[PDB]
Amino acid sequence: MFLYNLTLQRATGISFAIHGNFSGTKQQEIVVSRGKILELLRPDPNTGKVHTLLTVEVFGVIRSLMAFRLTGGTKDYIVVGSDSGRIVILEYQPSKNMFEKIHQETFGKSGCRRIVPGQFLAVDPKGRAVMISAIEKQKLVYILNRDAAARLTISSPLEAHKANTLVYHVVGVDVGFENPMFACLEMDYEEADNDPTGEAAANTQQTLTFYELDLGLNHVVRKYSEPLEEHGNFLITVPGGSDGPSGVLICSENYITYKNFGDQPDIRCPIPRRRNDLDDPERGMIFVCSATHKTKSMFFFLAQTEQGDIFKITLETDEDMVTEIRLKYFDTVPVAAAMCVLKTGFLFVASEFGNHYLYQIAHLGDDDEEPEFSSAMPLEDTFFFQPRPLKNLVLVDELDSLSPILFCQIADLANEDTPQLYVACGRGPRSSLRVLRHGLEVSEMAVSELPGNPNAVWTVRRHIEDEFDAYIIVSFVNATLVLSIGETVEEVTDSGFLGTTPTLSCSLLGDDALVQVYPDGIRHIRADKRVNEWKTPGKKTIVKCAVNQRQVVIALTGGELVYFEMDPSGQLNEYTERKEMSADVVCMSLANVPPGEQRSRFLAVGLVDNTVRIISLDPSDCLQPLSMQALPAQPESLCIVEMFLYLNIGLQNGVLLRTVLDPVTGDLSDTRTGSRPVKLFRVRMQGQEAVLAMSSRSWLSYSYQSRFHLTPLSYETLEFASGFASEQCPEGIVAISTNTLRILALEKLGAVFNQVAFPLQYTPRKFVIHPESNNLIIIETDHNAYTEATKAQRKQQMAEEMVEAAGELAAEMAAAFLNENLPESIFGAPKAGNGQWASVIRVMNPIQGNTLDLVQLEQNEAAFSVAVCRFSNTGEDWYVLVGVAKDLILNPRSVAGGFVYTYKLVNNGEKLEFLHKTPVEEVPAAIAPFQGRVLIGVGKLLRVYDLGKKKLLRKCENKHIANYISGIQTIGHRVIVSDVQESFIWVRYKRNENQLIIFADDTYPRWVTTASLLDYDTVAGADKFGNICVVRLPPNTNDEVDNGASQKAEVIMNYHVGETVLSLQKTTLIPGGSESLVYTTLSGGIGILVPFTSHEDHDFFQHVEMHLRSEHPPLCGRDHLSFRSYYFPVKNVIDGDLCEQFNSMEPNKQKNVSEELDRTPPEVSKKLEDIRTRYAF
Amino acid sequence: KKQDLDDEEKTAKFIEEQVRR
Amino acid sequence: AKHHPDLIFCRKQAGVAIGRLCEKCDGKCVICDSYVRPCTLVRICDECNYGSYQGRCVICGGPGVSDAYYCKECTIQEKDRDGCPKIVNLGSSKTDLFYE
RNA sequence: AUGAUGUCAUACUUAUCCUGUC
Structure with a gap:
């Protein structure tokens, strides 16, 4: 089974975003960083739309993206930090619509190791040097200098490692053409590892260390270092030199303290919160991202909080020192992973989840009644910032792409012949049911x-x-x-x-x-x-x-x-x-x-x-x-x-x-x-x-x-x-x-x-398609949240406590608090809690956007599985069984109990009536019909339950699971259950004695997330580490039986896709073509795997891939075979995305590859397009 | 390759027909 | 290596000086000590190439003519991303041969 | 009947190496 992976929709989720003059002209570009692809965006200043100028797959996980430019230059470079052990400097060439690698020097081994640099990368504002450091015990600084022909050249890097020291975030200091310094948050874990009493673990705060690179000595040394009051999450580089004073702002939990080096005193300012917040008061508040807008007159900063509160950060300063930090809430924004403030009033909002946004800097954020809490302003009490709508920026455009890795059902639910991709994607209040159809608007x-x-x-x-x-x-x-x-x-x-x-x-x-x-x-x-x-x-x-x-x-x-x-x-x-x-x-x-x-x-x-x-x-x-x-x-x-x-x-x-x-x-x-x-x-x-x-x-x-x-x-x-x-x-x-x-x-x-997209309320988990009703039954459950009735009771308690102050009693803020309902999709969802959750079941028609019915769960109820089928003891009445859990959150909080609610699906699947709710000792994460009965997997116990008048009578039970049953796919004769950390095993269910016996298992453990039965003996399952595997049972395996198991299953195909796959479905995307293994991704990408029909065509594709791996290397400095062999070695897998670069590569290299393949470059293009026309849309 | 190619053309035929449906 | 098990490498910081090989040690690898499959060039340290220490061979230590390169078997095994393998020590080799 | 230390030949490997000098 030789397959060929192909990408249909690229990943739309952006992990990093930079702005600057990458094209070398007056127009500024937006260099976005996706999961496994690099993207160059160019927003139109007249049309207000952002167009994708270039899109190239780096074939690796990029972990850092920064831009730099030399003194007196007219173009910004592109420093790309990836999972490989080499640092790559890229220079987008407009006269070719491609990113040209300027320099590439190897520093370590491949992989996302703790001692491998690539997690953090800081560049100097003067463009003299760049600093790349790991998470711990590794730090390198390379010098960048222009040549005589104005070419960027790199020097030998300087080692600056420090044993038993962890680096949280690093940022270069803005110096006025002096010795460049690199400030970073350090934490020494040497004392905490040599104390069994735990006293050295406590009272160990982070230390802000500024390492200066002596240009005259060609060596870097830790010049300044100072401990902090609290642990910091991110930093903000303040511009110094001729424009403003030097220094950096350290963001922390519910506090912000900009502490410049030298004789500058530390000025701290607490983070303002929203007035009458419905969240828990025990939870803190930190910054999510920060943007910097620098001009010749002055400079400002825009940082978003954990609730998406984008505040306009301003810092009053004296002649040589800083006076106070005056912050003011500009507007309200969703949770963005990166913010880019461009010229002429343009603000790019790259959302961490859901569709992205590009608000254009409309107002300056000042000259308003909004209270600007100054750094000098004393408080013993935090400036309760009011949740006012963003009245300083205007969403010029939105890049609402993918970043879900949730659930997807590709079926022809409409009257057309081409099947639509009904994929539920989103996170919490920004969730939506998007039906994806291959076409054009x-x-x-x-x-x-x-x-x-x-x-x-x-x-x-x-x-x-x-x-x-x-x-x-x-x-x-x-x-x-x-x-x-x-x-x-x-x-x-x-x-x-x-x-x-x-x-x-x-x-x-x-x-x-x-x-x-x-x-x-x-x-x-x-x-x-x-x-x-x-x-x-x-x-x-x-x-x-x-x-x-x-x-x-x-x-x-x-x-x-x-x-x-x-x-x-x-x-x-x-x-x-x-x-x-x-x-x-x-x-x-x-x-x-x-x-x-x-x-x-x-x-x-x-x-x-x-x-x-x-x-x-x-x-x-x-x-x-x-x-x-x-x-x-x-x-x-x-x-x-x-x-x-x-x-x-x-x-x-x-x-x-x-x-x-x-x-x-x-x-x-x-x-x-x-x-x-x-x-x-x-x-x-x-x-x-x-x-x-x-x-x-x-x-x-x-x-x-x-x-x-x-x-x-x-x-x-x-x-x-x-x-x-x-x-x-x-x-x-x-x-x-x-x-x-x-x-x-x-x-x-x-x-x-x-x-x-049809919007939902909470983050969905799985969806079920009714056979007769032709509707969708999706369950939306999200942790750390509260129910609607619980939020109403909390709002009533807050309104009762606001009247308890007896303020002349005569002030009624409850009429303005309880009546004003803030949108959770725009102003953020006010949800908190450690073990609290919020689950909601809703049945909606796929043709329209309205929901037929809605069922709310309890306060501490969290649903994880849902199934809709009929019972053998009953008639033709389809029952919807949904398993939920009680008191659950993460690994520290062990699950308490579980329940399984039953629905009637009345009015031909238009209304659901609660028949019974059978409890369970473990949390159920698997519900699937099997020969007229329902297989219920609660934890490590696989039980076969039947339909009962009072509760679900368990007719069978199996406790042979390793840790917990995460998924269950039931064949017509056997049953395939997927474990959490162990690979899926084949189990036969005896109908005579009601005893399930496992007759096959796997030899290699894998964190399986989703799976799909390809045949009666071949099953393909996804991996949580970004890989995809296909296991086939041997033909000599005896299903009738009575280290762990005797019969083992061999893995016939393994391929590291690089993205977290959570939905696999083998079907026909186009009528008349061939069926392919279409897979989804958590980063908003859609891929498809197609098997090879001819051995000669498979050998030609393998030779083309072997020629392309030598002729067109990835831009991230990593190897294609090393990227495909991240978790498991590659077996019968051909990456079509690497073969698709033959049309984008050099014509002489394409002619050389065609002469090595004894063909023509249009012949190779036709051979590449033939498989796409046969297997895809 | 060539013989397969003859077959390949037929392979294309099926997909094209599918499109028509 | 092969020719010498008691020899120690420099393993210093990698600079911008490209390594070279002598005419007697031309084509031989530094880590793998092979003659086929050259994939990556050899880079020398900054202190290892200064004044009279520049233009010398890494393995042989004599007058370097051609540039030295690393083997592809050492490149795929990540043995070329280490420090500068300059031969600093010289023990049990070319010592008693000078007397005869 | 292995194993032990011990003076003493014998084979084998290192693609070991023969113009090195102030």
Whole structure:
């Protein structure tokens, strides 16, 4: 079983985000750091949207991302700290749309070790040196200096290790071109490890040590060091030198203390909290992230707290020292992992969970009534900051991507044939039920019904220099309608077309002249009021036409071709010859003229005899055949386009065949576009020439980084389409529907999979699909939370305690506190507690966004498993059994008891009625039907329970589990239970004696998170360490039986995906293709594993991967085999993402790899695209 | 490779047909 | 190595000085002491290459001509990411051979 | 009947090494 892993949707969760002039121009870029891929974003200052400029997979876990620039430079570098033992300096090359590695020096071994540097990386603000240190006992500082040819060069690194010392966070000090210092939070654990009494473990606070790097001595030494009052989580580098005083702000729990080095006194300020907070008072408050905005006049800081309270941090200072720290709450934001303050009022909010946000710095945060707690302001009591809406920034854009690794069910719940990916993703109040469909979002800007039966649509501008269209032509069956698009589009008659007849084509020939194509003749309309007519010769009529930028080809009846040439004086000149064809013309195509050239060379003409022929339009070989190509069906439409150009041709059936643009016909490709005639329409998508198909599904083909990408439209089918450009619609497409006109536009680039999210209340765990009701039953449970009735009781207790102060008693803040309900999705969820939880069961229809029913659990109730099936003792009534736990949290708090509630699923799965709630001694984490009964796994006890009138009667029990049953997949004959730290084992259930016997086990333990049965003896399971494994039972294993087990199961496939997988499903993503092992990720990524059908193709893919591992190394300095062999060694796994870089790599290296593979680079591209077309959308 | 390639083309056929459905 | 089990390496901090190999010890690896599969170049320490200590061989210690490289078997075994393997000590080798 | 220390040959390995000098 040789498989081939492929990525369908990249990871959208960002772990780090930097801002600066990475492109070397005045525009600032946003370098985002995903899980296993690097991303370069460029926000539009006019449009307010963030576009992905580049996206490259680093094939490794990047743990640090920082930017730096030398003195007097104009471009910011990119320092990337990954899990490898090498430091990589990257320099994005715009003149190539790729990140060029400047330097790469190895420092240690691979892996996320404690003694391996790469976890922390600080850069100097002057760009003189960079410091990379590990979590403990390792620290290195390399010097960066420019060469004579302005090239960045690195020197030998300086070792600065310290034994038995742990580093929390490091940051470089802002020095005015002096000796650079690197401040970091240190903690000596030597005394705590040599004291069994535990006295040395207590009273051991963190010590802020500032290590200075002597440039004259070429060595670093710990110059300054001072202990702190409390433990710190992160630091904030204050700019010094000419702009502000030097120093750093140390963030801590409920306190902030900026303590500069030297004679500067320590000034501390407590963290302000929200007024009348519903959270627990015993829990502290720390900062989550911090942003710095530096200007020539002054500088400010923006740090978000644990509740997402973004406060505007300001520091009053004297001539040489700091006076006080004045903080003020700017607005309210979600929990963001990184914040980037850009120029011209732009704030990028990269959320740690859920969709991201990009608030633009609107207000300065000052000049308001908001109370700004100063550092000098004494308090013995913390400035209770009020939760005021962010009235200083405006979300310019949102990157709501993936970061869940929760649950996903890929099924065709809708009426369409293509299955949708119903994936519940989110965290707490930001959770949502997103149904992902592979398509494209169409934004209908205008829609108006059209009389009669329209057959075509056209849009021609007034001038060649005009940036927008001016005339819109609608061709009916017996006439033609022309409209003028000036933001008030109505019926127009003075255009000069005189549409009393249906029109075949309408475009602009000259710079300001128009050309209309009719079967009764040709009509030329210049800039002035002049009509140049050209009637058809004889009684024949024009069947088809082909217009261009400087060419006009027309086809009459009987295969009579007529060529018209555009004179440089502005007139049209007909050809001196008429070429005849062997059959009638059914399709004609004319490519656009180049800006350098004056005319097009190739002209495609489709015949009725199922054959395509190319005709040269040069004056040397005009009306001469160039290349012929047979077609399996009658052609319907043809269109040639650039990106290196290819000519597409659509047939009358649901299939189309394309060919390259050359003097001879080269490679060919085809796909089932169908039960509809495939028409070809040219469009402008993202500033590039794209093709728009007209069939039962409207697919838009567009190339993306030397790789084609064609997704269908998520709308109704259309008959004709044309590109549109106006002031209201800058980039749109006018599509003609059945007796209706619709002006749509494709704003979002949803080529991967478009999603529609239905929001939930808490973090979901698993979802169940009802067979008869066709609905979704998802349970949303989250720890450290309270229920709705518990929150209402806490609010009532707070309102009772607020009136207990007896303040003149006469002040009623309860009417403003209890009535005002703050949104948990926007202003954060006020939830706390150690053992408290909040579970909620809700049944919602997948077609709509509303929920049919909702069931709230108890206060200390937390559901972990859910199943919906029927009982053998009962009739056809589907029962929904959901197991919950009582008093649970983490490993320190041992689980108390458990319960299993039963639902009736009344009104054909529209309402749930609680029948019984059977308790349990252990927490149930497994519920699955098995031969009319329900298998209940509570802890390490696997019990088979039956349906009872009072409680679930357990008919069987099995205590052979190692630690705890985490998952259970039941085959028709056997049962496969998945342990927590042990690998899954196969167990046979005897129906005669009601005794479950384990007949197979595994030899290697793995922290399994999800699994799926591939066959009767082969099972594939995920790993918590970011790997994927597939175990197959041996054929000599005896299921009838009575270190741990005798029969062992061999692992036939193992591959480290690098992301936490929690959902696996083997199904067909597209009808007609092959089924693949589609897997989800916790970082918002979707992947698919496809098995190899041919041994020669598998060997070719293995040779291509072996060539690519030597020709294109990863940018993170790690090895591909070492990344694939992180947890388990690779066995029959081919990474298609590394093979996809052959089109993005160098052309000479691609030609060398193709010569080593004895093929062509387009042949290798076609062989790579064939597996994707066979296995994916 | 070539013989397989002949087969490969057929393989493509199935997927294309699937798309049509 | 092979040629000498009592020899000790320098294992100092890695600098920017590229290592070199003598004409008598050309092609031989430093750690693996092999002749095939060169994958990574040899980097010398800063104190090991200064003045008259520059341009000398790492293993042989004589006049270096060509640049030395590490074996691919030592590169895949992470034996090349250690310190500078400059031969500092010289014991039980080329001592009694000078007398004869 | 192993094992022990012991004076004394004999094979084997290290791709061991022969122009080194003030």
